[PDB]
Amino acid sequence: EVKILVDRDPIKTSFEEWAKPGHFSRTIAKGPDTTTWIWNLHADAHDFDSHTSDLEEISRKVFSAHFGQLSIIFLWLSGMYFHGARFSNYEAWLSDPTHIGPSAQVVWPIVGQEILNGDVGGGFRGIQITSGFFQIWRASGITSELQLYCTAIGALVFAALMLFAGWFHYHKAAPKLAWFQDVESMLNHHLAGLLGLGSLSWAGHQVHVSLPINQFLNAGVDPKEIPLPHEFILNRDLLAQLYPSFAEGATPFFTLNWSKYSEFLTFRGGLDPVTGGLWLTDIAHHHLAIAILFLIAGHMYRTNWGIGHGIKDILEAHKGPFTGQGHKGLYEILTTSWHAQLSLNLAMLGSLTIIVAHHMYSMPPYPYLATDYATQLSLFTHHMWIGGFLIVGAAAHAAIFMVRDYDPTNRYNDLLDRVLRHRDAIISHLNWVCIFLGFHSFGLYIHNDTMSALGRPQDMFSDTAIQLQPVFAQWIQNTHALAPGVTAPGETASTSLTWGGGELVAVGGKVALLPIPLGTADFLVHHIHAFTIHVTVLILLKGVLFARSSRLIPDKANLGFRFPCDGPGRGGTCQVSAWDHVFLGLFWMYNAISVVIFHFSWKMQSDVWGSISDQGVVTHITGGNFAQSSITINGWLRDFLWAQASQVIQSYGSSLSAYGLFFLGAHFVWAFSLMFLFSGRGYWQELIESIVWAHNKLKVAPATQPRALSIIQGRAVGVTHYLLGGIATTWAFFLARIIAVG
Amino acid sequence: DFIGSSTNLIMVTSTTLMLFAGRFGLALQTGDPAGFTLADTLACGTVGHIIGVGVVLGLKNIGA
Amino acid sequence: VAADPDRPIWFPGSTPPEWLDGSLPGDFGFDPLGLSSDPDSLKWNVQAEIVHCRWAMLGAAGIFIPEFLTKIGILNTPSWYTAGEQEYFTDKTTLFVVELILIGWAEGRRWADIIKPGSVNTDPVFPNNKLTGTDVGYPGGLWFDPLGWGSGSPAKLKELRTKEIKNGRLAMLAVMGAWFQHIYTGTGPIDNLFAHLADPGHATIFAA
Amino acid sequence: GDFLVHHAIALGLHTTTLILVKGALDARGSKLMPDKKDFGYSFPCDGPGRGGTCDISAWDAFYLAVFWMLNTIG
Amino acid sequence: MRDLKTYLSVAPVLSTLWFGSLAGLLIEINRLFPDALTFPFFS
Amino acid sequence: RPLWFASSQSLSYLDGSLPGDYGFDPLGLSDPEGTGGFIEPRWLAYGEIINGRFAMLGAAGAIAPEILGKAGLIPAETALPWFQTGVIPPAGTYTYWADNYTLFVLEMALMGFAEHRRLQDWYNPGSMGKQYFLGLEKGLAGSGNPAYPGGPFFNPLGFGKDEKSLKELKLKEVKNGRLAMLAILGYFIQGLVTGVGPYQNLLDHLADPVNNNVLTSLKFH
Ligand code: CLA
Ligand code: CLA
Ligand code: CLA
Ligand code: CLA
Ligand code: CLA
Ligand code: CLA
């Protein structure tokens, strides 16, 4: 059934098409009559569904494009590991990681920018990075710079291999459509073979290399004194001196006597109190169990043999009573459309990035991550933003499916039809609950603000005036703190210490994630988060559902996914397109993730992070001013924005001065974006035609006719400059704030 | 694995139980009167190993 | 410039490219990247090969002969690598300017000879003098070809010109070998040769 | 600083003036919309045809000039 | 190749080549001649 | 023809034309539907034969320092197993007449000549005989097939005088070669778990087969 259907030499390797730009499209492969052409050359560059009509060439194009992306990421990791090897203080950071700033970038002394090379620590002048690569490397048992250079060279090798792979799998031997459509084998392999064997091999590294090395690094051993990792593979006596279960080898394994493996495959949940990260002993067992699970999960789908679930046979089996035929047809609209799959995988990968952000602060998995408050904050914020962007792109590509790849005649689905038929009910109830949440989450902030301004602090919604305690979250918190016991024995402690009954993991002078107390401010801000998420889903789901038709435009699909409008008629029908809906959902994702990372930064700096002296008195970075000031907007303006932006603006003449520079610059780029979002094309075309008169007066009339940006392009430029500016403002503000007071 | 013990006997019994459930009333081509392929016996023995390890460690932790 | 469809090529079994017909003096079909796919690009790269070859042959001689007649045929030469650090009767930036002014003259005549095939054959001072060279890159004049060997049958001329660039190609390789040797290895090239001939095994590029 | 902010002020005045003068002189029409006098001073647009005509009216010149005016007076 | 040079002459590739060369020029000038506010030659 | 674990997909294209076929293609890499690149039935059979010949040379040479190294014919220092000879300096390096890496460059140069000429007979078999190679290009023709040149430098004394004899000889070839490939895999896994030579792994089994098997030696080193 499944096979390796692949055809040779379909496309010629030649620069002939490089010389002819815009070759991929018909209207673009004839010349730039205008300047918009170049914007259409980049816009449609990766719109392979519009270049061709057959799915075979599209699948080959995106396959080799994924290979290019993997080449890029291998080259990026090459850069990171190399810069760690040569331009870093990692060899010194291992000695005193609680006081040396992790730095992996040095600037060139030319124009005074050598101030950026600051006193990170370790006898090294550079930039205090906030990526957490140093923490990984301590978790990977690197203990050198040679290993990092070798890793960089190997990553460069794999980058070149992936580049050759894309070239081979497009130009030399490109797979045909029967190969991609065999999703059964693809899932069987990516579950068991990528995620199963990948987690298994990382468990092997974690058992053989990370665990024995971190058993010494945490035990006051200098990295120069540690035995090399391969010495544990060659000499098992040195490995057994700390974990004697290796003296028996795999006889405990194959005889199912796993009870004599707990020296290195543990379940003692919680954070290693010597470094603040999770127990690597638990992470080895984790990735091992995940290997078992993905290995049994990747033998689920029939590929060639009589066993396995045909995914058609799973989907067609589910047919609801008043839900109609049910999931029949979905295997044909997911295997004959890349955009549907792209949307699904984007949505899940984005929510997974967010879950990563959430589980990487509350269960610090790397050593000296929780105490590197810059790394923790930056990683949470990063992955939150990536998740929001991926979800918003999932919306865009659901819409693109609905416009292009949706065919109720051939590739019919029942549930999608049922969703389209009461789409007004969906959007009406979402448009209601967004207003309800908006009111009962932000009008509460307004109420607190007014009551505090009228001198009525006894009337706010605070932890002192009117109790809005998260009773449900408090119950989950208290039962997860008292989870070690009847419900989860053999764990020795809670799976995390972000719950009230937990304890404080004092690492050096720092505090590293004691319990998080949930009060009225957490209720208010969590409902603000639900609000912003619900409005984003309103906008995006509305764009997806009404991508094809509305009461306003019933032929919206014929106009396309990415179109500005259908004229000033009907009172005006700007931004009816799903592209414009996702362009608005970008702003709302921005507001959502911005208030999310603000909640994170403030709740952490006030209720979690800080410094605990040897007497035991923990003093937080702000001073616990979240539950009292995060109930009103003036606190976010005063105690969070105004106050914590006293280290990014005062950082002029310091090592953190590029942060204030990009603070002002990202401010600027955001505001500059407002020139695009607010304005319209017609003014700029008329202005351009005036200055084109000024040029034609001097025989400087360019043949590529100067055209103002297309409307959808003005909206794209506006949203990208707006997001870049707000996000770089926040990035600079967070990084300078959290590196300065640290 | 020190054959004749409880873990080994339990494992062999579970593996043979799953192989029997496969050969007679299911749950690498025609080489058996019942159409039992190499992949079918591989599958049945692997899930037999799964249940065997599960029940072995479940008797170890509580009981045996 | 007669084609040879069945000439021996760099990679036997391969099909040499269309733009290498066999006409050139020493074209074994070695152009995988296609850096001479164009006709004029080929005509330029030919003279580039010729002059890199000739400069590299003069370089290989002035490296190894002063390094061969110094280690055994005893003389006193400082080196080939650190000869730029040594001092002479002129400042280091001065004689660089002088040899630039003097070499740029000839190289401008060469530029003219390449752009316009026959333009610089008359001596501008004494127009009775001449260079009897029809082929670009091979000026058959007295100062270059006084012994009359650069003329005759085009087949003998082709075998002689491929002899030339054959010596010149490994001269290029030898000069950059001396470069990479004096960098990786400390001592000079002929000393590297003697250390290789002492123990061919434990004397190579490898040291670990 | 007074020099630099006076030049910022000049930027603001010249730019607000640019927006307003351009709207006023292209109020009757331009090349993109030569019969703009027939649509009046305040009209939304002329449609997505001819590349797009968002904010083409002289009213919208006034609009974006109010933005630049607020900026300048700020 | 003629088409490779046609691509190298394209506006972005030639723009980044031109601005890399230019940026190296200004960079090496601001390293050899740093911290410059006034033109002192024939001042 | 015999069909040992032959899928219905497999025997559509495994029509007995290849030497030593038994229908065993459960995966289907030799399916001729498309299958460009290196995955193709012709290159796959060629690679089978070549890895088999090299594995025969391996399984003979990885243990010849032990089957007649313990018998006394060979000295003791030149009697190490396959993994202590110098191919893994982490496991052991014998000091040969040269450095361990100049010998690798020797391999690369010599086998580069040999194997690139083999490749250029694979692509177009009419070559290797049209180009002068120090006069010995006459017997490098590669008459009819790439895996079976039959030249006077590869088949000096005739064995394929009849296609029956040549077919049976190719069958014996591929069978001994597959056996040697399995042997090399056994060598690698045995030296990976036991860290001892393969002939010693045989002798520990022959002495007491019960406590010397894969079962009891599941613990490594
Ligand atoms: C280097 C050798 C080489 C050559 C000469 C070609 C030649 C060709 N390819 Mg192939 N290709 C190659 C390598 C090569 N390819 C590799 C390595 C891959 C894997 C990624 C592909 C994948 C591929 C696909 C999927 C497709 C082609 C196509 C084409 C044709 C048109 C390409 C074009 O005009 O866009 C030229 C484009 C560029 C020069 C730039 C592309 C971007 C590169 C890959 C990465 C950019 C990295 C950069 C750092 C990121 C930006 C950040 C920056 C701001 C810092 C042409 C025949 C197309 C075709 O034939 O369809 C009709 C097609 O669909 N190629
Ligand atoms: C798995 C991830 C993924 C994949 C494979 C795709 C793939 C695609 N998307 Mg989707 N998309 C994604 C994520 C993804 N996108 C995300 C995360 C979002 C949310 C914003 C979107 C939103 C989105 C929309 C709204 C649209 C697409 C479209 C497209 C298609 C064409 C895009 C194109 O040609 O632009 C080629 C590349 C460019 C034009 C460059 C973009 C320039 C960016 C914005 C630069 C600035 C960002 C940078 C990080 C900041 C540094 C600045 C510095 C350089 C100074 C293509 C099928 C379009 C489509 O299908 O049209 C019919 C379309 O309309 N996508
Ligand atoms: C602070 C600026 C701001 C405010 C207040 C709003 C307000 C709103 N937006 Mg808008 N929006 C904004 C900026 C803003 N937006 C920007 C900059 C963009 C650009 C992308 C958008 C894009 C946008 C879209 C695309 C969508 C919204 C939606 C919404 C609504 C959700 C909240 C709601 O109705 O709950 C209640 C109202 C509030 C929370 C607003 C504050 C009001 C306070 C609490 C009380 C007001 C006083 C009270 C009534 C007394 C009256 C006194 C009397 C004298 C008048 C609401 C109309 C969504 C919508 O319409 O569906 C729900 C939607 O789909 N907005
Ligand atoms: C100075 C450099 C140079 C240049 C410009 C040429 C130019 C030419 N050669 Mg010659 N050649 C050279 C050196 C050079 N050769 C050397 C040193 C060898 C021996 C290794 C050869 C062997 C050779 C053969 C066998 C043949 C040619 C042929 C040709 C022609 C077609 C190929 C082409 O477009 O080349 C253009 C070449 C370049 C533009 C130079 C490449 C520049 C890149 C950056 C090189 C980078 C990688 C390199 C390996 C690193 C050098 C390290 C070094 C220390 C080893 C053209 C006239 C063919 C022909 O028609 O003969 C007349 C032919 O059959 N050449
Ligand atoms: C437009 C506003 C503006 C102005 C006027 C300046 C002006 C200056 N900046 Mg500032 N700067 C600006 C914006 C501005 N900058 C912005 C936006 C940034 C952020 C990107 C910076 C960031 C910045 C830094 C970080 C630094 C400067 C520096 C400088 C000084 C550069 C002097 C120098 O090296 O030139 C020397 C001249 C050249 C590089 C040009 C050489 C041109 C070649 C040689 C051709 C000319 C010869 C030609 C053949 C003709 C000869 C005559 C004959 C043949 C006919 C100068 C005072 C540097 C400094 O020293 O500050 C005081 C410095 O360190 N600036
Ligand atoms: C996304 C990754 C990916 C995917 C899905 C494919 C898929 C495919 N490739 Mg491509 N390929 C890739 C990456 C990928 N390749 C890369 C990165 C390279 C460069 C190294 C190549 C080079 C390549 C060539 C040269 C050829 C293919 C071929 C094929 C096809 C058949 C392969 C097969 O049956 O397996 C067969 C697999 C084996 C026989 C095993 C190979 C043994 C190696 C040495 C180890 C593989 C394990 C891997 C490295 C992980 C271990 C890591 C290690 C450190 C432990 C199929 C269309 C062939 C084809 O039919 O043309 C399309 C073909 O000729 N590919």
Ligand SMILES: CC(/C=C/C=C(C)/C=C/[C@@]12O[C@]1(C)C[C@@H](O)CC2(C)C)=C\C=C\C=C(C)\C=C\C=C(C)\C=C\[C@@]12O[C@]1(C)C[C@@H](O)CC2(C)C
């Ligand atoms: C000119 C030259 C050397 C000149 C040396 C001189 C003057 C030396 C002078 C001195 O020593 C003396 C006398 C005395 C010393 O005291 C001082 C100095 C001053 C040091 C070397 C060129 C050296 C040039 C070299 C090594 C060129 C190598 C090119 C290669 C390998 C090309 C490969 C390809 O281009 C093809 C052929 C075809 C394509 O399709 C594919 C690829 C693969 C790209």
Ligand SMILES: CC1=C(/C=C/C(C)=C/C=C/C(C)=C/C=C/C=C(C)/C=C/C=C(C)/C=C/C2=C(C)CCCC2(C)C)C(C)(C)CCC1
């Ligand atoms: C998310 C992401 C990231 C990261 C990632 C990572 C880090 C991952 C990892 C992953 C992994 C870590 C993976 C792994 C994989 C693996 C594999 C894929 C393997 C394979 C193997 C094999 C296949 C083998 C086989 C064998 C052997 C040898 C043994 C026995 C026999 C057999 C044959 C079975 C980043 C940040 C960059 C960006 C974004 C995205």
Ligand SMILES: CC1=C(C/C=C(\C)CCC[C@H](C)CCC[C@H](C)CCCC(C)C)C(=O)c2ccccc2C1=O
């Ligand atoms: C400013 C603006 C424009 C005009 C924006 C223009 C066309 C961008 C300015 C020209 C760009 C910067 C290209 C010029 C640079 C070229 C690459 C040429 C190179 C020249 C040197 C710099 C190398 C719109 O078309 C528009 C449309 C809809 C809503 C809002 C707006 C909007 O706000």
